[PDB]
């Protein structure tokens, strides 16, 4: 497994890391298998969604924020309980099928690191499962 | 990897593809392994839930709609951002353990393709790992 | 094969830390590098990975999920958490973040539950 380093900027943002997953796939030399993307953070996660217009990621973030605001019924008064919730909603990992040395995903389907508590120095693990 | 073509009807509906997955496993001959079901769309997803009482899936779709309505604070011009959100919530894939040549599912569990922007020409990928 | 654990849940909603049960399955498998798949065979419960230190974080997730979705409520919450989660096995150890715990998320207890743990490759 290889560990990539990520530098997030805004409090919450979607970072397209599809390039990072493909980098791991080439480096592995695997033609067929599985690519597992894991996020070791509890205030961030991984999701797969539209890679085209950034209006889609904006809508997801804004609306996730609307339903689970920064301020509210949170005994975890540290202020990022909302990020913990959203992290679980997106998921701690996502997997993509590897076919003919390529990630088998939709045309405009990209892999995102979903930051709900930036700016921070993050990590993302990528494991390529051969054959 | 096996690919199944699906033609969805309603703009939002849960399509039970458990048997489709089961057929992939049986035809693969694999006895012990892992079945990975992947949805290559950004306005649809894959989930596992109640396979008996149709009221359950109905309530999920309805509740998802109430919390994330078709019209609202959305900049995306296609007017389908509510679908993109629900897709990430259900997830782009799910996996099921294969034991003794059969899907190790709970008595009430069914695998669903969750369409949030139909009717459209969809696909589902099923990868059997051993 | 698969290692099945039984869990006896109590309160209506509860996050049960099963990180050790999973590590247990890992150590017993003998594998050094692979994948640990944790699967919940119930439609009113799920599996998620989140803060394993502060009890209020799980309390906030449960209560706020409840606020937005006040037993079909258990069914929708089960799908939001997910029916399964995957963890990288490296050096015969779960490659988890410092504050990451694996949780079985009960939304309709008290019940006799089960979690399956399959170690791959």
């Amino acid at each position: 497994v290889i560990e990539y380093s990520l530098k997030t900027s805004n409090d919450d943002q979607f970072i397209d890391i599809t390039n990072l997953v493909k980098k791991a796939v080439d480096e592995s030399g695997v033609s067929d298998g599985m690519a597992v993307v894991f996020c070791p953070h509890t205030t961030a996660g991984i999701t797969i969604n539209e890679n085209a217009d950034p209006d889609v990621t904006r809508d997801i973030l804004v609306n996730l924020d609307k339903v689970f605001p920064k301020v509210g019924d949170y005994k975890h008064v540290e202020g990022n309980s909302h990020a913990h919730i959203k992290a679980s909603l997106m998921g701690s990992s996502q997997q993509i099928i590897i076919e003919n040395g390529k990630l088998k995903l939709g045309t405009w389907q990209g892999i995102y690191f979903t930051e709900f508590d930036g700016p921070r120095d993050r990590k993302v693990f990528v494991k390529i499962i051969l054959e």
Side-chain angles (χ1 to χ4, degrees), chain A:
Chain A
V1 301
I2 58 285
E3 301 166 55
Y4 293 115
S5 177
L6 282 297
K7 182 68 183 66
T8 63
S9 67
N10 219 162
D11 64 304
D12 67 334
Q13 57 175 38
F14 269 39
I15 305 170
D16 193 313
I17 60 169
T18 309
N19 292 318
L20 260 54
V21 182
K22 293 181 176 179
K23 178 186 294 185
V25 175
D26 293 324
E27 288 294 295
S28 78
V30 177
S31 175
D32 290 66
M34 291 285 299
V36 174
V37 189
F38 185 100
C39 173
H41 308 83
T42 57
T43 60
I46 306 289
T47 193
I48 299 182
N49 213 295
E50 182 112 313
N51 205 318
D53 182 13
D55 280 354
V56 179
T57 64
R58 191 237 68 142
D59 286 346
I60 297 173
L61 290 161
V62 173
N63 286 280
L64 279 180
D65 178 70
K66 182 185 300 178
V67 178
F68 299 107
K70 187 165 187 174
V71 304
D73 193 0
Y74 306 115
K75 280 191 175 181
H76 191 249
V77 296
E78 303 186 6
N80 62 358
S81 182
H82 65 304
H84 282 107
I85 296 169
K86 297 173 193 176
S88 272
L89 297 182
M90 295 298 94
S92 52
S93 85
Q94 300 299 166
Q95 42 177 27
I96 310 79
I97 296 169
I98 297 170
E99 187 185 69
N100 285 47
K102 296 182 178 181
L103 293 174
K104 194 170 175 54
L105 44 77
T107 309
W108 293 98
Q109 192 176 45
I111 305 166
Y112 290 105
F113 177 96
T114 63
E115 175 64 277
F116 299 115
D117 191 42
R120 300 176 71 173
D121 295 297
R122 307 291 212 175
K123 290 291 195 59
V124 68
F125 311 152
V126 183
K127 186 171 184 65
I128 302 296
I129 301 302
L130 175 60
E131 221 175 7

